[PDB]
Protein backbone atom coordinates (compact mmCIF):
# COMPACT_ATOMS: atom_id res chain seq x y z
CA UNK A 1 0.00 0.00 0.00
CA UNK A 2 1.33 3.41 -0.86
CA UNK A 3 -0.45 4.95 2.07
CA UNK A 4 1.78 2.91 4.35
CA UNK A 5 4.82 3.98 2.31
CA UNK A 6 3.73 7.57 2.64
CA UNK A 7 3.43 7.07 6.34
CA UNK A 8 7.01 5.84 6.63
CA UNK A 9 8.19 8.92 4.71
CA UNK A 10 6.16 11.45 6.64
CA UNK A 11 7.38 10.10 9.98
CA UNK A 12 10.94 10.27 8.73
CA UNK A 13 10.64 13.80 7.57
CA UNK A 14 9.11 14.88 10.87
CA UNK A 15 12.02 13.25 12.61
CA UNK A 16 14.64 14.86 10.36
CA UNK A 17 13.14 18.31 10.75
CA UNK A 18 13.00 17.93 14.54
CA UNK A 19 16.68 17.07 14.58
CA UNK A 20 17.54 20.03 12.40
CA UNK A 21 15.62 22.10 14.88
CA UNK A 22 17.55 20.78 17.88
CA UNK A 23 20.84 21.39 16.07
CA UNK A 24 19.77 24.88 15.06
CA UNK A 25 18.99 25.68 18.71
CA UNK A 26 22.41 24.30 19.68
CA UNK A 27 23.95 26.53 16.99
CA UNK A 28 22.27 29.63 18.36
CA UNK A 29 23.74 28.80 21.75
CA UNK A 30 27.17 28.55 20.12
CA UNK A 31 26.66 31.85 18.37
CA UNK A 32 26.03 33.46 21.77
CA UNK A 33 29.08 31.78 23.11
CA UNK A 34 30.89 33.30 20.15
CA UNK A 35 29.56 36.73 20.96
CA UNK A 36 30.95 36.32 24.47
CA UNK A 37 34.32 35.45 23.00
CA UNK A 38 34.26 38.47 20.77
CA UNK A 39 33.55 40.54 23.85
CA UNK A 40 36.45 39.11 25.85
CA UNK A 41 38.70 40.00 22.91
CA UNK A 42 37.39 43.53 22.90
CA UNK A 43 38.03 43.89 26.61
CA UNK A 44 41.60 42.54 26.13
CA UNK A 45 42.05 44.85 23.02
CA UNK A 46 41.81 47.91 25.24
CA UNK A 47 44.27 46.33 27.81
CA UNK B 1 40.43 44.91 13.31
CA UNK B 2 39.73 41.22 13.22
CA UNK B 3 37.46 41.64 16.18
CA UNK B 4 35.11 43.80 14.13
CA UNK B 5 35.17 41.22 11.33
CA UNK B 6 34.36 38.53 13.84
CA UNK B 7 31.48 40.62 15.04
CA UNK B 8 30.00 40.90 11.57
CA UNK B 9 30.29 37.11 11.13
CA UNK B 10 28.78 36.18 14.47
CA UNK B 11 25.80 38.43 13.76
CA UNK B 12 25.42 36.85 10.35
CA UNK B 13 25.52 33.34 11.70
CA UNK B 14 22.88 34.07 14.25
CA UNK B 15 20.74 35.53 11.56
CA UNK B 16 21.22 32.47 9.34
CA UNK B 17 20.43 30.06 12.17
CA UNK B 18 17.28 32.03 13.05
CA UNK B 19 16.11 31.71 9.46
CA UNK B 20 16.83 28.00 9.41
CA UNK B 21 14.78 27.79 12.54
CA UNK B 22 11.79 29.59 11.01
CA UNK B 23 11.99 27.36 7.93
CA UNK B 24 12.24 24.24 10.05
CA UNK B 25 9.11 25.28 11.95
CA UNK B 26 7.34 25.87 8.68
CA UNK B 27 8.45 22.43 7.50
CA UNK B 28 7.05 20.74 10.58
CA UNK B 29 3.73 22.37 9.87
CA UNK B 30 3.85 21.01 6.32
CA UNK B 31 4.69 17.56 7.64
CA UNK B 32 1.56 17.69 9.82
CA UNK B 33 -0.41 18.80 6.84
CA UNK B 34 1.05 15.77 5.06
CA UNK B 35 -0.01 13.49 7.90
CA UNK B 36 -3.54 14.84 7.50
CA UNK B 37 -3.34 14.01 3.78
CA UNK B 38 -2.26 10.49 4.56
CA UNK B 39 -5.17 10.16 6.91
CA UNK B 40 -7.69 11.32 4.31
CA UNK B 41 -6.23 8.66 2.01
CA UNK B 42 -6.67 6.02 4.66
CA UNK B 43 -10.30 7.02 5.11
CA UNK B 44 -10.82 6.90 1.31
CA UNK B 45 -9.34 3.33 1.28
CA UNK C 1 44.41 32.36 25.44
CA UNK C 2 40.73 32.14 24.80
CA UNK C 3 41.50 31.28 21.26
CA UNK C 4 41.55 27.65 22.28
CA UNK C 5 38.00 28.18 23.55
CA UNK C 6 37.07 29.81 20.30
CA UNK C 7 38.57 26.85 18.57
CA UNK C 8 36.50 24.35 20.48
CA UNK C 9 33.35 26.31 19.60
CA UNK C 10 34.13 26.74 15.92
CA UNK C 11 34.81 22.99 15.54
CA UNK C 12 31.50 22.27 17.24
CA UNK C 13 29.61 24.63 15.01
CA UNK C 14 31.20 23.05 11.93
CA UNK C 15 30.08 19.70 13.25
CA UNK C 16 26.51 20.87 13.93
CA UNK C 17 26.15 22.51 10.53
CA UNK C 18 27.49 19.39 8.78
CA UNK C 19 24.83 17.36 10.54
CA UNK C 20 22.15 19.82 9.50
CA UNK C 21 23.48 19.49 6.00
CA UNK C 22 23.27 15.70 6.01
CA UNK C 23 19.72 15.88 7.37
CA UNK C 24 18.74 18.48 4.80
CA UNK C 25 20.01 16.24 2.00
CA UNK C 26 18.08 13.31 3.52
CA UNK C 27 14.99 15.51 3.56
CA UNK C 28 15.34 16.34 -0.11
CA UNK C 29 15.49 12.63 -0.83
CA UNK C 30 12.34 12.22 1.15
CA UNK C 31 10.63 14.96 -0.75
CA UNK C 32 11.08 12.82 -3.86
CA UNK C 33 10.11 9.69 -2.24
CA UNK C 34 6.96 11.79 -1.72
CA UNK C 35 6.71 12.94 -5.28
CA UNK C 36 6.86 9.26 -6.35
CA UNK C 37 4.02 8.54 -3.92
CA UNK C 38 2.04 11.36 -5.43
CA UNK C 39 2.66 9.89 -8.83
CA UNK C 40 1.45 6.41 -7.83
CA UNK C 41 -1.73 8.06 -6.56
CA UNK C 42 -2.22 9.85 -9.83
CA UNK C 43 -1.74 6.62 -11.78
CA UNK C 44 -4.44 4.98 -9.67
CA UNK D 1 -8.15 17.55 -5.06
CA UNK D 2 -6.07 15.74 -2.43
CA UNK D 3 -3.46 14.70 -4.93
CA UNK D 4 -3.08 18.31 -6.11
CA UNK D 5 -3.04 19.50 -2.53
CA UNK D 6 -0.33 17.11 -1.67
CA UNK D 7 1.59 18.40 -4.63
CA UNK D 8 1.40 21.96 -3.35
CA UNK D 9 2.71 20.81 0.01
CA UNK D 10 5.56 18.85 -1.47
CA UNK D 11 6.73 21.72 -3.70
CA UNK D 12 6.60 24.01 -0.67
CA UNK D 13 8.72 21.64 1.34
CA UNK D 14 11.23 21.22 -1.41
CA UNK D 15 11.55 24.98 -1.51
CA UNK D 16 11.94 25.27 2.26
CA UNK D 17 14.56 22.56 2.34
CA UNK D 18 16.54 24.14 -0.51
CA UNK D 19 16.66 27.40 1.41
CA UNK D 20 17.78 25.64 4.57
CA UNK D 21 20.47 24.09 2.44
CA UNK D 22 21.66 27.43 1.05
CA UNK D 23 21.75 28.88 4.56
CA UNK D 24 23.61 25.86 5.89
CA UNK D 25 26.21 26.27 3.12
CA UNK D 26 26.50 29.97 3.99
CA UNK D 27 27.04 28.98 7.62
CA UNK D 28 29.83 26.63 6.61
CA UNK D 29 31.48 29.48 4.80
CA UNK D 30 31.20 31.65 7.88
CA UNK D 31 32.70 28.89 10.00
CA UNK D 32 35.73 28.83 7.70
CA UNK D 33 35.92 32.56 7.89
CA UNK D 34 35.87 32.17 11.63
CA UNK D 35 38.70 29.66 11.55
CA UNK D 36 40.74 32.18 9.59
CA UNK D 37 39.93 34.82 12.24
CA UNK D 38 41.02 32.49 15.02
CA UNK D 39 44.27 31.98 13.15
CA UNK D 40 44.91 35.74 12.76
CA UNK D 41 44.33 36.00 16.50
CA UNK D 42 46.88 33.30 17.11
CA UNK D 43 49.42 35.13 14.97
CA UNK D 44 48.71 38.43 16.80
CA UNK D 45 48.89 36.55 20.20
CA UNK D 46 52.61 35.91 19.53
Amino acid sequence: MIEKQMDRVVKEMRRQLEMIDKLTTRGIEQVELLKRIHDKLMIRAVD
Side-chain angles (χ1 to χ4, degrees), chain A residues 1-3 5-7 9-13 15-21 23-25 27-35 37-39 41-43 45-46:
Chain A
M1 294 300 293
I2 66 87
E3 307 106 342
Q5 192 183 343
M6 166 153 186
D7 197 54
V9 176
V10 162
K11 286 177 182 339
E12 179 110 38
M13 253 178 286
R15 186 180 121 215
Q16 284 165 4
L17 284 160
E18 279 163 4
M19 264 208 274
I20 290 174
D21 199 60
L23 291 168
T24 287
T25 295
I28 288 296
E29 270 168 38
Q30 297 304 49
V31 165
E32 295 333 313
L33 222 46
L34 236 44
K35 204 68 195 62
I37 273 143
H38 166 273
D39 287 359
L41 296 175
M42 284 300 235
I43 280 160
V46 173

